Short mmCIF file of C-alpha atoms and ligand atoms in Angstrom, two decimals:
data_model
loop_
_atom_site.label_atom_id
_atom_site.label_comp_id
_atom_site.label_asym_id
_atom_site.label_seq_id
_atom_site.Cartn_x
_atom_site.Cartn_y
_atom_site.Cartn_z
CA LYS A 1 17.16 -19.67 -22.90
CA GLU A 2 17.29 -16.14 -24.27
CA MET A 3 15.89 -13.34 -22.12
CA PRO A 4 12.98 -11.49 -23.78
CA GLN A 5 13.47 -7.73 -23.86
CA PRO A 6 11.46 -4.94 -25.54
CA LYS A 7 12.84 -2.51 -28.09
CA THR A 8 15.80 -0.36 -27.06
CA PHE A 9 16.60 3.20 -28.16
CA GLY A 10 20.37 3.62 -28.26
CA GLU A 11 21.84 4.87 -25.00
CA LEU A 12 18.34 5.55 -23.64
CA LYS A 13 17.82 1.75 -23.55
CA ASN A 14 14.15 0.83 -22.82
CA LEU A 15 13.42 4.08 -20.97
CA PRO A 16 11.38 5.70 -23.80
CA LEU A 17 8.87 2.84 -23.61
CA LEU A 18 7.47 4.21 -20.35
CA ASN A 19 7.30 8.02 -20.49
CA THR A 20 3.92 7.93 -18.73
CA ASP A 21 2.27 8.80 -15.45
CA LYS A 22 1.11 5.14 -15.28
CA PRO A 23 4.32 3.08 -15.51
CA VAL A 24 3.14 -0.10 -13.76
CA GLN A 25 0.15 -0.33 -16.09
CA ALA A 26 2.54 0.13 -19.02
CA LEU A 27 4.77 -2.64 -17.67
CA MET A 28 1.74 -4.93 -17.38
CA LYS A 29 1.14 -4.48 -21.11
CA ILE A 30 4.76 -5.39 -21.87
CA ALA A 31 4.42 -8.45 -19.63
CA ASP A 32 1.34 -9.49 -21.60
CA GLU A 33 3.36 -9.26 -24.82
CA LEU A 34 6.56 -10.97 -23.63
CA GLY A 35 5.36 -13.42 -20.98
CA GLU A 36 6.58 -14.56 -17.59
CA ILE A 37 9.91 -12.67 -17.62
CA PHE A 38 11.50 -9.84 -19.56
CA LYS A 39 14.60 -7.71 -19.12
CA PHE A 40 14.18 -3.93 -18.93
CA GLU A 41 17.11 -1.50 -19.05
CA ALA A 42 17.39 2.17 -18.25
CA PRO A 43 20.66 4.14 -18.37
CA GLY A 44 22.48 2.88 -15.29
CA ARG A 45 20.36 -0.10 -14.28
CA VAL A 46 18.82 -3.42 -15.33
CA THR A 47 15.64 -5.09 -14.07
CA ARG A 48 14.03 -8.44 -14.84
CA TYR A 49 10.26 -8.25 -14.42
CA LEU A 50 8.53 -11.45 -13.29
CA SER A 51 4.87 -12.24 -13.97
CA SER A 52 4.38 -16.00 -13.46
CA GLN A 53 3.79 -17.82 -10.19
CA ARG A 54 6.36 -20.38 -11.37
CA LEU A 55 9.22 -17.86 -11.42
CA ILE A 56 7.98 -15.68 -8.56
CA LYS A 57 7.78 -18.76 -6.33
CA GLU A 58 11.51 -19.26 -6.89
CA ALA A 59 12.28 -15.57 -6.41
CA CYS A 60 10.61 -15.82 -2.98
CA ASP A 61 13.16 -18.44 -1.85
CA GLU A 62 15.01 -16.44 0.79
CA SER A 63 17.94 -18.86 0.73
CA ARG A 64 18.69 -17.63 -2.81
CA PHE A 65 17.16 -14.13 -3.02
CA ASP A 66 16.93 -11.25 -0.56
CA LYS A 67 14.88 -8.06 -0.63
CA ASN A 68 16.38 -5.47 -2.97
CA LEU A 69 16.21 -1.70 -2.64
CA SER A 70 14.84 -0.99 -6.11
CA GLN A 71 15.63 2.40 -7.62
CA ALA A 72 12.15 3.41 -6.45
CA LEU A 73 12.95 2.50 -2.84
CA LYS A 74 16.31 4.26 -3.14
CA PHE A 75 14.53 7.47 -4.14
CA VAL A 76 11.89 7.05 -1.43
CA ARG A 77 14.77 6.59 1.02
CA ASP A 78 15.34 10.34 0.65
CA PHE A 79 12.51 10.69 3.20
CA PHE A 80 12.00 7.13 4.50
CA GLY A 81 15.69 6.90 5.42
CA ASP A 82 16.70 3.60 6.98
CA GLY A 83 13.19 2.84 8.25
CA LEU A 84 11.75 -0.64 7.87
CA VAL A 85 10.62 -0.25 4.25
CA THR A 86 13.86 1.20 2.85
CA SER A 87 16.64 -0.55 4.81
CA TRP A 88 18.64 -3.54 3.62
CA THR A 89 17.94 -6.79 5.44
CA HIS A 90 21.57 -6.85 6.61
CA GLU A 91 21.55 -3.16 7.53
CA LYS A 92 21.75 -3.24 11.33
CA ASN A 93 18.78 -0.94 11.90
CA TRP A 94 16.38 -3.18 9.97
CA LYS A 95 16.54 -6.21 12.28
CA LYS A 96 16.86 -3.93 15.31
CA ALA A 97 13.73 -1.94 14.44
CA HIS A 98 11.87 -5.09 13.37
CA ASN A 99 12.43 -6.72 16.76
CA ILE A 100 11.57 -3.50 18.61
CA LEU A 101 8.38 -2.77 16.65
CA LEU A 102 6.94 -6.24 15.97
CA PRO A 103 5.16 -6.29 19.38
CA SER A 104 3.09 -3.30 18.24
CA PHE A 105 1.35 -5.63 15.76
CA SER A 106 0.62 -8.55 18.09
CA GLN A 107 -2.93 -9.84 18.48
CA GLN A 108 -3.20 -8.14 21.88
CA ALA A 109 -2.02 -4.85 20.38
CA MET A 110 -4.54 -5.12 17.53
CA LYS A 111 -7.35 -5.51 20.06
CA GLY A 112 -6.09 -2.38 21.80
CA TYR A 113 -6.24 -0.40 18.55
CA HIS A 114 -9.84 -1.37 17.76
CA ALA A 115 -11.53 1.38 19.77
CA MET A 116 -9.44 4.09 18.10
CA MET A 117 -10.14 2.64 14.66
CA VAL A 118 -13.84 2.90 15.53
CA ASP A 119 -13.28 6.53 16.55
CA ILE A 120 -12.14 7.45 13.04
CA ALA A 121 -14.64 5.15 11.32
CA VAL A 122 -17.48 6.89 13.18
CA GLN A 123 -16.18 10.22 11.88
CA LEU A 124 -16.32 8.90 8.32
CA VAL A 125 -19.90 7.66 8.75
CA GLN A 126 -21.02 10.94 10.32
CA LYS A 127 -19.52 13.00 7.50
CA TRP A 128 -21.52 11.06 4.91
CA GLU A 129 -24.68 11.13 7.05
CA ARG A 130 -24.39 14.93 7.12
CA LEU A 131 -24.07 15.53 3.37
CA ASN A 132 -26.96 17.28 1.66
CA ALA A 133 -28.82 15.59 -1.20
CA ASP A 134 -27.06 17.65 -3.89
CA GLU A 135 -23.61 16.55 -2.67
CA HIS A 136 -21.46 13.49 -3.41
CA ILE A 137 -18.48 11.60 -2.00
CA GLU A 138 -14.89 11.82 -3.24
CA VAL A 139 -14.01 8.22 -2.40
CA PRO A 140 -10.17 8.04 -2.39
CA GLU A 141 -10.01 11.46 -0.72
CA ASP A 142 -12.27 10.37 2.15
CA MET A 143 -10.57 6.98 2.47
CA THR A 144 -7.28 8.87 2.85
CA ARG A 145 -8.80 11.02 5.59
CA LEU A 146 -9.93 7.85 7.41
CA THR A 147 -6.66 5.74 6.99
CA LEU A 148 -4.21 8.59 7.79
CA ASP A 149 -6.14 9.54 10.92
CA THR A 150 -6.30 5.88 11.96
CA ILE A 151 -2.55 5.29 11.83
CA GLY A 152 -1.98 8.71 13.38
CA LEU A 153 -4.24 7.95 16.34
CA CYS A 154 -3.44 4.25 16.79
CA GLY A 155 0.30 4.59 16.23
CA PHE A 156 1.14 7.99 17.67
CA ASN A 157 -1.88 9.24 19.68
CA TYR A 158 -1.89 12.16 17.24
CA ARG A 159 -5.03 13.55 15.60
CA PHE A 160 -4.60 14.76 12.04
CA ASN A 161 -8.29 15.78 12.16
CA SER A 162 -8.57 15.19 8.42
CA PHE A 163 -12.38 15.26 8.59
CA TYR A 164 -12.15 18.85 9.86
CA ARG A 165 -10.51 19.87 6.57
CA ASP A 166 -12.35 20.18 3.27
CA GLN A 167 -9.14 19.88 1.24
CA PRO A 168 -6.49 17.18 1.64
CA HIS A 169 -4.35 17.48 4.75
CA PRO A 170 -1.07 19.30 3.95
CA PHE A 171 0.89 16.19 4.96
CA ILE A 172 -1.01 14.26 2.27
CA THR A 173 -0.40 16.91 -0.39
CA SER A 174 3.35 16.82 0.32
CA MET A 175 3.34 13.01 0.41
CA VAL A 176 1.63 12.71 -2.97
CA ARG A 177 4.05 15.18 -4.55
CA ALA A 178 7.04 13.37 -3.03
CA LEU A 179 5.86 9.94 -4.18
CA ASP A 180 5.07 11.35 -7.63
CA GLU A 181 8.57 12.86 -7.84
CA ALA A 182 10.19 9.54 -6.92
CA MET A 183 8.12 7.80 -9.60
CA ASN A 184 8.88 10.45 -12.23
CA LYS A 185 12.61 10.30 -11.48
CA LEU A 186 12.61 6.68 -12.60
CA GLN A 187 11.83 7.86 -16.15
CA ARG A 188 13.89 11.04 -16.67
CA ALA A 189 17.00 10.58 -18.80
CA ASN A 190 18.95 13.67 -17.65
CA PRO A 191 18.10 14.23 -13.96
CA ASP A 192 20.52 17.17 -13.58
CA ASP A 193 18.96 19.16 -16.42
CA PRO A 194 17.99 22.62 -15.07
CA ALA A 195 14.40 21.85 -16.14
CA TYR A 196 14.20 19.73 -12.95
CA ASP A 197 15.52 22.36 -10.51
CA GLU A 198 11.98 23.30 -9.47
CA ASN A 199 11.16 19.62 -8.92
CA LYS A 200 14.16 19.29 -6.60
CA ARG A 201 13.25 22.43 -4.65
CA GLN A 202 9.66 21.20 -4.25
CA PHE A 203 10.91 17.75 -3.22
CA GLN A 204 12.94 19.25 -0.36
CA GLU A 205 10.01 21.46 0.64
CA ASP A 206 7.72 18.42 0.81
CA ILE A 207 10.28 16.49 2.87
CA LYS A 208 10.34 19.45 5.28
CA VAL A 209 6.54 19.45 5.58
CA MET A 210 6.77 15.78 6.54
CA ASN A 211 9.44 16.44 9.16
CA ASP A 212 7.64 19.47 10.60
CA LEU A 213 4.75 17.08 11.22
CA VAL A 214 7.09 14.57 12.88
CA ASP A 215 8.21 17.39 15.18
CA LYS A 216 4.63 17.95 16.35
CA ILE A 217 4.12 14.23 17.01
CA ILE A 218 7.29 14.08 19.11
CA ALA A 219 6.51 17.34 20.91
CA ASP A 220 2.96 16.25 21.72
CA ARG A 221 4.14 12.91 23.13
CA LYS A 222 6.70 14.72 25.28
CA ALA A 223 3.95 16.94 26.71
CA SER A 224 1.36 14.19 27.22
CA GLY A 225 0.42 13.27 30.78
CA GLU A 226 -1.33 10.09 29.69
CA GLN A 227 0.61 6.83 29.49
CA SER A 228 0.61 5.20 26.05
CA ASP A 229 2.02 1.87 24.91
CA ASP A 230 1.64 2.36 21.17
CA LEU A 231 3.99 2.23 18.18
CA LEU A 232 5.67 5.49 19.20
CA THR A 233 6.22 4.22 22.74
CA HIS A 234 8.10 1.21 21.36
CA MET A 235 10.12 3.41 19.00
CA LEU A 236 11.22 5.56 21.95
CA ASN A 237 11.71 2.95 24.68
CA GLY A 238 12.43 -0.39 22.99
CA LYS A 239 15.97 -1.70 23.42
CA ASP A 240 18.33 -3.82 21.36
CA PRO A 241 19.00 -6.74 23.76
CA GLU A 242 22.61 -6.96 22.55
CA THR A 243 23.63 -3.33 23.11
CA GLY A 244 21.01 -1.98 25.52
CA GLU A 245 20.52 0.92 23.10
CA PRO A 246 17.23 2.14 21.62
CA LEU A 247 16.79 3.13 18.01
CA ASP A 248 18.77 6.30 17.42
CA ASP A 249 16.81 9.54 17.16
CA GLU A 250 17.43 9.81 13.41
CA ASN A 251 15.97 6.33 12.76
CA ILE A 252 12.95 7.03 14.98
CA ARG A 253 12.05 10.04 12.84
CA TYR A 254 12.37 7.86 9.74
CA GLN A 255 10.13 5.18 11.27
CA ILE A 256 7.47 7.79 12.06
CA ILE A 257 7.43 9.02 8.45
CA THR A 258 7.56 5.43 7.19
CA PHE A 259 4.57 4.28 9.24
CA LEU A 260 2.49 7.41 8.69
CA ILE A 261 2.83 7.01 4.92
CA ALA A 262 3.17 3.26 4.47
CA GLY A 263 0.57 2.77 7.20
CA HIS A 264 -2.28 4.49 5.34
CA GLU A 265 -1.73 5.06 1.60
CA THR A 266 -2.13 1.48 0.40
CA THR A 267 -5.06 0.90 2.78
CA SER A 268 -6.81 3.94 1.31
CA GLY A 269 -6.18 2.47 -2.13
CA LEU A 270 -7.61 -0.88 -1.04
CA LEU A 271 -10.79 0.65 0.36
CA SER A 272 -11.21 2.73 -2.81
CA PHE A 273 -10.77 -0.24 -5.15
CA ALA A 274 -13.07 -2.36 -2.99
CA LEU A 275 -15.88 0.20 -3.13
CA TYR A 276 -15.31 0.58 -6.87
CA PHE A 277 -15.76 -3.14 -7.50
CA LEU A 278 -18.77 -3.26 -5.18
CA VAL A 279 -20.72 -0.56 -7.02
CA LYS A 280 -19.83 -2.27 -10.33
CA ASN A 281 -21.04 -5.70 -9.10
CA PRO A 282 -24.47 -5.15 -7.51
CA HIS A 283 -25.07 -8.78 -6.52
CA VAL A 284 -21.72 -8.87 -4.72
CA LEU A 285 -22.61 -5.59 -3.03
CA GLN A 286 -25.92 -7.06 -1.83
CA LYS A 287 -24.19 -10.12 -0.37
CA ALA A 288 -21.58 -8.00 1.42
CA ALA A 289 -24.27 -5.63 2.70
CA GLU A 290 -26.37 -8.57 3.91
CA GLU A 291 -23.39 -9.86 5.90
CA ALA A 292 -22.69 -6.44 7.40
CA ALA A 293 -26.30 -6.08 8.56
CA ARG A 294 -26.34 -9.64 9.91
CA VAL A 295 -23.07 -9.38 11.84
CA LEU A 296 -22.87 -5.74 13.00
CA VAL A 297 -25.88 -5.83 15.32
CA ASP A 298 -24.57 -3.32 17.89
CA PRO A 299 -24.26 0.49 17.69
CA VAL A 300 -20.55 0.12 16.90
CA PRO A 301 -18.54 -2.94 15.85
CA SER A 302 -16.60 -5.02 18.33
CA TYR A 303 -13.26 -6.60 17.49
CA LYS A 304 -14.80 -10.08 17.39
CA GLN A 305 -17.58 -8.97 15.04
CA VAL A 306 -15.07 -7.62 12.50
CA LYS A 307 -13.55 -11.11 12.42
CA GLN A 308 -16.96 -12.55 11.56
CA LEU A 309 -17.18 -10.40 8.40
CA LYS A 310 -15.93 -13.27 6.25
CA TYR A 311 -17.34 -12.14 2.90
CA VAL A 312 -16.19 -8.55 3.37
CA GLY A 313 -12.73 -10.04 3.85
CA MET A 314 -13.12 -11.94 0.58
CA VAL A 315 -14.14 -8.71 -1.16
CA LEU A 316 -10.98 -7.01 0.11
CA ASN A 317 -8.70 -9.89 -0.89
CA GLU A 318 -10.26 -9.97 -4.36
CA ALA A 319 -9.70 -6.22 -4.66
CA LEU A 320 -6.06 -6.80 -3.70
CA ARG A 321 -5.82 -9.60 -6.26
CA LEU A 322 -6.81 -7.41 -9.20
CA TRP A 323 -5.16 -4.16 -8.02
CA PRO A 324 -2.57 -4.73 -5.29
CA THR A 325 -2.03 -1.18 -4.13
CA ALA A 326 1.69 -1.76 -3.53
CA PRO A 327 2.07 -3.33 -6.99
CA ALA A 328 5.73 -4.43 -6.95
CA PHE A 329 8.57 -5.57 -4.74
CA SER A 330 12.18 -6.21 -5.69
CA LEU A 331 14.66 -9.00 -5.01
CA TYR A 332 18.32 -9.60 -5.82
CA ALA A 333 20.29 -12.79 -6.38
CA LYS A 334 22.48 -13.55 -3.37
CA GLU A 335 24.87 -15.46 -5.66
CA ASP A 336 25.18 -16.56 -9.26
CA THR A 337 22.24 -18.86 -9.92
CA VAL A 338 19.79 -20.13 -12.53
CA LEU A 339 16.12 -19.11 -12.37
CA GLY A 340 13.43 -21.52 -13.52
CA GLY A 341 16.09 -23.81 -14.97
CA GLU A 342 16.26 -21.41 -17.90
CA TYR A 343 17.53 -17.93 -16.99
CA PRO A 344 21.08 -17.46 -15.66
CA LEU A 345 21.50 -14.66 -13.14
CA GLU A 346 24.61 -13.06 -11.69
CA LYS A 347 25.06 -12.07 -8.06
CA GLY A 348 23.09 -8.89 -7.44
CA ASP A 349 20.80 -9.16 -10.47
CA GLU A 350 17.45 -7.54 -9.74
CA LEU A 351 14.13 -9.35 -10.02
CA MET A 352 11.00 -7.19 -9.83
CA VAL A 353 7.75 -8.95 -8.94
CA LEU A 354 4.81 -7.52 -10.90
CA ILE A 355 2.08 -8.39 -8.40
CA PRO A 356 -0.85 -7.50 -10.72
CA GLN A 357 0.52 -9.97 -13.28
CA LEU A 358 1.14 -12.70 -10.69
CA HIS A 359 -2.51 -12.25 -9.68
CA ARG A 360 -3.59 -12.74 -13.32
CA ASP A 361 -1.64 -15.97 -13.92
CA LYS A 362 -4.30 -18.14 -15.57
CA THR A 363 -2.47 -21.41 -14.85
CA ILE A 364 -3.13 -20.59 -11.18
CA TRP A 365 -6.41 -18.68 -11.05
CA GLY A 366 -8.28 -20.01 -14.08
CA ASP A 367 -9.30 -18.13 -17.19
CA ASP A 368 -11.63 -15.62 -15.47
CA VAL A 369 -8.78 -13.61 -13.89
CA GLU A 370 -10.32 -10.27 -14.93
CA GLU A 371 -13.65 -10.96 -13.19
CA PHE A 372 -14.25 -9.60 -9.69
CA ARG A 373 -15.33 -12.80 -7.91
CA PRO A 374 -14.75 -12.77 -4.13
CA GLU A 375 -16.04 -16.34 -4.00
CA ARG A 376 -12.58 -17.22 -5.34
CA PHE A 377 -11.71 -17.25 -1.64
CA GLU A 378 -14.79 -18.98 -0.18
CA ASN A 379 -13.71 -22.61 -0.75
CA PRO A 380 -10.26 -23.17 0.83
CA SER A 381 -9.42 -26.20 -1.33
CA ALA A 382 -9.86 -24.10 -4.50
CA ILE A 383 -7.50 -21.25 -3.52
CA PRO A 384 -3.99 -21.64 -5.01
CA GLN A 385 -0.73 -22.01 -3.20
CA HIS A 386 1.93 -19.19 -3.06
CA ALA A 387 0.12 -17.22 -5.74
CA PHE A 388 -1.28 -14.28 -3.74
CA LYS A 389 1.35 -11.77 -2.59
CA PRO A 390 -0.19 -8.31 -2.02
CA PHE A 391 1.84 -8.03 1.22
CA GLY A 392 5.28 -9.07 -0.01
CA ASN A 393 7.40 -12.04 0.97
CA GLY A 394 9.31 -13.62 3.82
CA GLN A 395 10.92 -11.74 6.67
CA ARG A 396 10.50 -8.51 4.66
CA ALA A 397 6.74 -9.02 4.26
CA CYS A 398 4.29 -6.36 5.39
CA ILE A 399 4.45 -5.89 9.15
CA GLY A 400 1.05 -4.17 9.17
CA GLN A 401 -0.97 -6.64 7.11
CA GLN A 402 -3.46 -7.45 9.87
CA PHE A 403 -3.62 -3.80 10.90
CA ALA A 404 -4.58 -2.90 7.32
CA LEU A 405 -7.13 -5.69 6.86
CA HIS A 406 -8.80 -5.18 10.23
CA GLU A 407 -9.12 -1.45 9.56
CA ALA A 408 -10.43 -2.05 6.03
CA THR A 409 -12.87 -4.78 7.08
CA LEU A 410 -14.18 -2.68 9.97
CA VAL A 411 -14.73 0.42 7.84
CA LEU A 412 -16.15 -1.35 4.79
CA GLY A 413 -18.54 -3.25 7.05
CA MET A 414 -19.74 -0.03 8.66
CA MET A 415 -20.08 1.64 5.26
CA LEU A 416 -22.18 -1.27 3.98
CA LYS A 417 -24.31 -1.33 7.13
CA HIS A 418 -25.16 2.37 7.04
CA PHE A 419 -25.55 3.31 3.37
CA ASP A 420 -26.75 2.41 -0.05
CA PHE A 421 -24.20 3.43 -2.68
CA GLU A 422 -24.95 4.84 -6.14
CA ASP A 423 -22.45 4.98 -9.01
CA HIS A 424 -24.20 8.13 -10.17
CA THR A 425 -21.60 9.04 -12.84
CA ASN A 426 -21.06 5.52 -14.21
CA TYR A 427 -17.44 6.10 -13.28
CA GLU A 428 -14.78 4.67 -15.61
CA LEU A 429 -11.85 3.21 -13.69
CA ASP A 430 -8.84 5.54 -13.76
CA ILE A 431 -5.87 4.28 -11.74
CA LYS A 432 -3.49 6.99 -10.54
CA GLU A 433 0.09 5.86 -9.92
CA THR A 434 2.26 7.34 -7.16
CA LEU A 435 4.38 4.19 -7.00
CA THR A 436 1.28 2.89 -5.21
CA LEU A 437 -2.04 2.48 -7.03
CA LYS A 438 -5.39 4.14 -6.34
CA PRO A 439 -8.51 5.15 -8.31
CA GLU A 440 -8.71 8.84 -9.17
CA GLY A 441 -11.89 10.76 -9.84
CA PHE A 442 -13.96 8.01 -8.22
CA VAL A 443 -17.15 9.59 -6.86
CA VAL A 444 -20.34 8.06 -5.46
CA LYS A 445 -23.54 9.10 -3.72
CA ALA A 446 -24.38 7.46 -0.39
CA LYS A 447 -28.00 7.28 0.75
CA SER A 448 -28.25 6.75 4.50
CA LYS A 449 -30.19 3.77 5.80
CA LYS A 450 -30.80 5.84 8.97
CA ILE A 451 -29.34 3.31 11.42
CA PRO A 452 -28.18 5.10 14.60
CA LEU A 453 -24.52 5.09 15.54
C1 LIG B 501 -3.11 -2.57 1.66
C2 LIG B 501 -2.31 -2.23 2.67
C3 LIG B 501 -0.88 -2.58 2.63
C4 LIG B 501 -0.23 -3.24 1.64
C5 LIG B 501 -0.83 -3.76 0.36
C6 LIG B 501 1.14 -3.35 2.03
C7 LIG B 501 2.09 -3.99 1.22
C8 LIG B 501 3.41 -4.11 1.60
C9 LIG B 501 4.39 -4.78 0.85
C10 LIG B 501 4.19 -5.47 -0.48
C11 LIG B 501 5.56 -4.70 1.54
C12 LIG B 501 6.88 -5.27 1.12
C13 LIG B 501 7.60 -4.28 0.20
C14 LIG B 501 8.97 -4.80 -0.13
O1 LIG B 501 9.21 -6.03 -0.07
O2 LIG B 501 9.88 -4.01 -0.46
C15 LIG B 501 5.30 -3.98 2.72
C16 LIG B 501 6.26 -3.70 3.67
C17 LIG B 501 5.94 -3.03 4.84
N1 LIG B 501 4.75 -2.54 5.24
FE1 LIG B 501 3.15 -2.67 4.27
N2 LIG B 501 1.31 -2.78 3.24
C18 LIG B 501 0.14 -2.28 3.66
C19 LIG B 501 -0.18 -1.60 4.84
C20 LIG B 501 0.76 -1.33 5.82
C21 LIG B 501 0.49 -0.69 7.04
C22 LIG B 501 -0.85 -0.19 7.51
C23 LIG B 501 1.69 -0.61 7.73
C24 LIG B 501 1.89 -0.02 9.06
C25 LIG B 501 0.86 0.50 9.72
C26 LIG B 501 2.69 -1.21 6.91
C27 LIG B 501 4.00 -1.33 7.26
C28 LIG B 501 4.93 -1.97 6.44
C29 LIG B 501 6.34 -2.09 6.85
C30 LIG B 501 6.96 -1.58 8.12
C31 LIG B 501 6.96 -2.75 5.86
C32 LIG B 501 8.42 -3.12 5.80
C33 LIG B 501 8.70 -4.26 6.78
C34 LIG B 501 10.17 -4.58 6.77
O3 LIG B 501 10.78 -4.71 5.69
O4 LIG B 501 10.78 -4.72 7.85
N3 LIG B 501 2.10 -1.62 5.74
N4 LIG B 501 3.98 -3.60 2.74
C1 LIG B 502 2.60 -0.44 2.10
C2 LIG B 502 3.27 0.59 1.21
C3 LIG B 502 4.44 0.25 0.35
C4 LIG B 502 5.01 -1.11 0.25
C5 LIG B 502 5.04 1.32 -0.48
C6 LIG B 502 4.50 2.68 -0.45
C7 LIG B 502 3.38 3.00 0.38
C8 LIG B 502 2.92 4.42 0.39
C9 LIG B 502 2.77 1.96 1.22
O1 LIG B 502 1.73 2.25 1.98
C10 LIG B 502 5.13 3.75 -1.29
C11 LIG B 502 6.01 3.22 -2.38
C12 LIG B 502 6.81 1.99 -1.98
C13 LIG B 502 7.93 2.35 -1.03
C14 LIG B 502 7.43 1.36 -3.18
O2 LIG B 502 6.52 0.80 -4.08
C15 LIG B 502 6.95 0.49 -5.33
C16 LIG B 502 6.08 0.58 -6.39
C17 LIG B 502 6.47 0.29 -7.65
C18 LIG B 502 7.74 -0.09 -7.93
C19 LIG B 502 8.10 -0.43 -9.35
C20 LIG B 502 8.81 0.59 -10.19
S1 LIG B 502 9.49 -0.24 -11.61
C21 LIG B 502 8.94 1.04 -12.51
O3 LIG B 502 9.50 1.35 -13.53
N1 LIG B 502 7.93 1.75 -12.04
C22 LIG B 502 7.82 1.60 -10.74
O4 LIG B 502 6.98 2.15 -10.10
C23 LIG B 502 8.66 -0.20 -6.90
C24 LIG B 502 8.24 0.10 -5.61
O5 LIG B 502 6.04 1.03 -1.31
#
């Protein structure tokens, strides 16, 4: 069977078809035109974009396909290094760091993080309680304050104190510019053109800002008199059983950057999308708010109570269905093989999973895929099989999935308990792309219910 492919432009291949600050959304349109799979070429690389659960199910067979470092991950590696997100599965430091850091996401560890998550969540609530009537909330900006500070405190006993800053934290500003640069590099035909010299200088400056922050985290741990057993403790003290060696210093720095960035950006996106869909679906908002009030009966939430916020969890999963904030992951063929009994692949051929398209496969989800309907997830028998992949696949799946969802469920529950939300601008959804996805310009007003904290 012939591989669908969009129009090419000489030696620029398909690259002119993007030329946009919203490439994933452009690729979704192409997927809608060409179906479950299409080839996409740029100068120097080829990708096959998958959109159907039928093909993606096969791609997730780890006996035939392994995680690929997409060009995007290769660019992000310029500051993620060989951390968990940007290392090959057979790169020694991936398995070594995975074994050393997996205990930091056990159930017992999660319970240990709860109190610190509440610390930051309380700061978010208090900020909104203290706004004057003429003010409003910048949603993604405040969700970023919350999620960055949470991973900073839980993972590294470091306080970014983002709620003590009225502009984005400098680490965030450098992160956004670095992620934007990586995304933009995917589309530029002549990367060595002098017109990009300033981009390269800024990219290095933003990488330095990140590493100056890592220095403070390491210095502050060295000076601490308290005893921690958090993510940073495992980075520093965990051993490879085979060699008796810890992660080398260079890798540790990369893991810190990896977890600070990967450990908050997509969770901020999730919370922003969730609040967007809530204010656009008032009956769903009422049901979620009713659950929050019913379950969160104490001055602050306990770990167990967060687990009883079932419908809030459905809201979050349904937000991830429509707009998975890490919208793609990449695989490569371990050997020559045939995909879906139709598409021959050669060893090393790249398959890119378009998660937003997977999550809109009507043969799986029904015809109403564009509706925000958390009840999709209320009746177990009616939820599809391997059709929902916001956290990746297999042994390279998200290590922090339960960290993210516990944080998001806790915070969204507290938000719904303490405020009524008004979409005072009738905001039109505008999804900013920085590889990851997040609403931009999303503002609301929050009227306190005056419930003490
Ligand atoms: C909505 C929130 C999040 C989403 C949607 C998400 C999604 C993903 C996805 C799709 C992958 C796989 C990417 C690939 O296959 O190349 C991944 C990997 C990873 N995520 Fe997340 N993630 C989230 C939050 C977090 C958090 C909070 C942390 C840490 C605190 C984290 C740590 C990681 C790590 C370490 C990996 C790589 C694991 C490995 O390959 O060994 N993520 N994430
Ligand atoms: C949890 C998490 C993940 C997984 C994460 C990132 C963050 C910040 C996270 O919090 C950053 C980007 C990145 C390293 C990579 O995300 C990608 C997004 C899109 C793509 C697709 C390429 S194909 C194209 O032409 N346009 C793209 O963006 C690849 C990777 O992933």
